[PDB]
Write an enzyme that holds these catalytic residues in place. Structure first.
Site, mmCIF file in Angstrom:
data_model
loop_
_atom_site.group_PDB
_atom_site.id
_atom_site.type_symbol
_atom_site.label_atom_id
_atom_site.label_comp_id
_atom_site.label_asym_id
_atom_site.label_seq_id
_atom_site.Cartn_x
_atom_site.Cartn_y
_atom_site.Cartn_z
ATOM 1 N N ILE A 13 2.718 26.723 43.553
ATOM 2 C CA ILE A 13 1.294 27.156 42.203
ATOM 3 C C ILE A 13 0.515 25.463 43.044
ATOM 4 O O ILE A 13 -0.385 25.546 43.289
ATOM 5 C CB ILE A 13 0.600 27.477 40.977
ATOM 6 C CG1 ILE A 13 2.237 25.971 40.124
ATOM 7 C CG2 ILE A 13 1.132 28.627 40.579
ATOM 8 C CD1 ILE A 13 1.762 25.804 38.498
ATOM 9 N N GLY A 16 2.737 18.281 45.087
ATOM 10 C CA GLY A 16 2.860 16.879 44.731
ATOM 11 C C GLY A 16 3.505 15.906 45.099
ATOM 12 O O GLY A 16 4.185 15.698 46.449
ATOM 13 N N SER A 17 3.390 14.476 45.231
ATOM 14 C CA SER A 17 3.763 13.510 45.079
ATOM 15 C C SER A 17 5.352 13.138 46.203
ATOM 16 O O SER A 17 5.178 12.359 46.843
ATOM 17 C CB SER A 17 3.519 12.011 44.453
ATOM 18 O OG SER A 17 4.305 12.679 42.811
ATOM 19 N N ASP A 20 7.261 20.159 45.243
ATOM 20 C CA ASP A 20 6.483 21.006 45.459
ATOM 21 C C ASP A 20 5.955 21.277 43.601
ATOM 22 O O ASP A 20 7.121 21.016 42.719
ATOM 23 C CB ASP A 20 6.793 21.842 45.485
ATOM 24 C CG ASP A 20 6.045 21.698 47.594
ATOM 25 O OD1 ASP A 20 4.543 20.593 48.002
ATOM 26 O OD2 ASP A 20 6.455 22.333 48.460
ATOM 27 N N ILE A 21 5.457 21.705 42.936
ATOM 28 C CA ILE A 21 5.308 22.903 41.820
ATOM 29 C C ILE A 21 5.180 23.646 41.784
ATOM 30 O O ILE A 21 4.177 24.618 42.771
ATOM 31 C CB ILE A 21 3.408 22.016 41.360
ATOM 32 C CG1 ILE A 21 3.004 21.134 42.011
ATOM 33 C CG2 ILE A 21 3.979 22.606 39.583
ATOM 34 C CD1 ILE A 21 4.470 19.711 40.481
ATOM 35 N N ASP A 126 -1.772 4.330 40.941
ATOM 36 C CA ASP A 126 -1.898 5.055 41.876
ATOM 37 C C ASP A 126 -3.517 6.183 40.956
ATOM 38 O O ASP A 126 -3.348 7.562 40.752
ATOM 39 C CB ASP A 126 -1.502 6.342 42.279
ATOM 40 C CG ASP A 126 -2.082 6.325 43.250
ATOM 41 O OD1 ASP A 126 -2.799 6.538 44.474
ATOM 42 O OD2 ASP A 126 -1.700 7.866 44.247
HETATM 43 C C1 LIG Z 1 -1.306 24.210 39.720
HETATM 44 N N1 LIG Z 1 -1.087 23.117 38.490
HETATM 45 C C2 LIG Z 1 -1.444 23.574 37.170
HETATM 46 C C3 LIG Z 1 -0.305 22.044 36.306
HETATM 47 N N2 LIG Z 1 0.205 21.834 35.187
HETATM 48 C C4 LIG Z 1 0.552 21.093 34.668
HETATM 49 C C5 LIG Z 1 1.190 20.461 36.320
HETATM 50 C C6 LIG Z 1 0.406 20.187 37.429
HETATM 51 C C7 LIG Z 1 1.461 18.662 38.663
HETATM 52 C C8 LIG Z 1 0.477 18.603 39.167
HETATM 53 N N3 LIG Z 1 1.005 17.529 39.670
HETATM 54 C C9 LIG Z 1 0.992 17.130 40.971
HETATM 55 N N4 LIG Z 1 2.592 17.365 39.065
HETATM 56 C C10 LIG Z 1 1.965 18.589 38.706
HETATM 57 C C11 LIG Z 1 3.587 18.605 38.075
HETATM 58 C C12 LIG Z 1 4.245 17.466 37.729
HETATM 59 C C13 LIG Z 1 5.432 17.082 37.290
HETATM 60 C C14 LIG Z 1 6.050 17.796 35.868
HETATM 61 F F1 LIG Z 1 7.265 18.022 35.859
HETATM 62 C C15 LIG Z 1 5.160 19.351 36.689
HETATM 63 C C16 LIG Z 1 4.048 19.356 37.544
HETATM 64 C C17 LIG Z 1 0.235 21.246 37.864
HETATM 65 C C18 LIG Z 1 -0.322 21.854 38.426
HETATM 66 O O1 LIG Z 1 -0.148 21.684 39.974
#
Ligand SMILES: CN1Cc2nccc(-c3cn(C)nc3-c3ccc(F)cc3)c2C1=O
EC number: 2.7.11.1
Length: 291
Positions: A13, A16-17, A20-21, A126
């Site tokens: 979905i 991330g840094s 992936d999410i 950041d």
């Molecule tokens: C589309 N969404 C919805 C949503 N909800 C909650 C967090 C995030 C989310 C976005 N980023 C950049 N990182 C995270 C994340 C971080 C740690 C975690 F353990 C899980 C997710 C998102 C997301 O990307």
């Protein structure tokens, strides 16, 4: 796929840094979650460290709850409550224009999130719109802060000894929102998270920053050009046409000493007094709620 016996892993979905999410479900609780996955064997493993920081931050207003941490197959797994879109996604969704009321509603909460992280002996490093997410449902009025991948302890947890003044440091964060001290290679401290927030608020006001989208040959030359543009742009020029509070906010952050404890109350009161002079109500009706 099954994650820690309780979670069901769905499709990707987001990004991330350093992992992936994915969409997930807490099957036992009947609640949607976001699952961050990081390869068990990688040259730069960071999920575990981040988990410890989130755990220390638990209980704080706008700190996402971490439901679970562990290892599953070829991945290190972190499970967070599902959140809404980031301030960058909402800004783009709003045609890169936020009303003064939305900027001030956001400023109030964002200063508080940063103060909370600082009270927990960490600097974020950041501060950018992408790292602030709105909650969903009953939490839809709440700004959450995420991504502790570049976060660093700035003081000892018990002694409160601030980390020493260091020079010739690498640009840790995003060049667009970096403080002038960061461009100079100075060790980041509390003031730098707040100065970055000042550039984020001006970015919401203008739609873009004057050092944004500069033409360059290499990413290091782009940082040099951004540094130069930032140091050549007076705060009064950057903030021209906008309430003086944005300029006062940035001048205060730039005046802070390396180990100074910022007066967060004063900074929130600066914007709150402007919010009241404007006749606005703290009703949490943001621009996107009017769509
Ligand atoms: C589309 N969404 C919805 C949503 N909800 C909650 C967090 C995030 C989310 C976005 N980023 C950049 N990182 C995270 C994340 C971080 C740690 C975690 F353990 C899980 C997710 C998102 C997301 O990307």
């Amino acid at each position: 796929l099954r994650v820690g016996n309780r979670y069901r892993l769905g499709r990707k979905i987001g990004s991330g840094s350093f992992g992936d999410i994915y969409l997930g479900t807490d099957i036992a609780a009947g609640e949607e979650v976001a699952i961050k996955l990081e390869c068990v064997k990688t040259k730069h493993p960071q999920l575990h460290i981040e988990s410890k920081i989130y755990k220390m931050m638990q209980g704080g207003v706008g700190i996402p709850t971490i439901r679970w941490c562990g290892a599953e197959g070829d991945y290190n797994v972190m499970v967070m409550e599902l959140l809404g879109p980031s301030l960058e996604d909402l800004f783009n969704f709003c045609s890169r224009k936020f009303s003064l009321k939305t900027v001030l509603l956001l400023a109030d909460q964002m200063i508080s999130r940063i103060e909370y992280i600082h009270s927990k002996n960490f600097i974020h490093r950041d501060v950018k719109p992408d790292n602030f997410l709105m909650g969903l449902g009953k939490k839809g009025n709440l700004v959450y802060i995420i991504d502790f991948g570049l976060a660093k302890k700035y003081r000892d947890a018990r002694t409160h000894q601030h980390i020493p003044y260091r020079e010739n440091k690498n640009l840790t964060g995003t060049a667009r929102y970096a403080s002038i001290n960061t461009h100079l290679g100075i060790e980041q401290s509390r003031r730098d998270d707040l100065e970055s927030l000042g550039y984020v608020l001006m970015y919401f006001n203008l739609g873009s920053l004057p050092w944004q989208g500069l033409k360059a040959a290499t990413k290091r030359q782009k940082y040099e050009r951004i540094s130069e543009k930032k140091m050549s742009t007076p705060i009064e020029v950057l903030c021209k046409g906008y309430p003086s509070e944005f300029a006062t906010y940035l001048n205060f952050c730039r005046s802070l000493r390396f180990d100074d404890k910022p007066d967060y109350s004063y900074l929130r009161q600066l914007f709150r007094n402007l919010f009241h002079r404007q006749g606005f109500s703290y009703d949490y009706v943001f621009d996107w709620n009017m769509l």
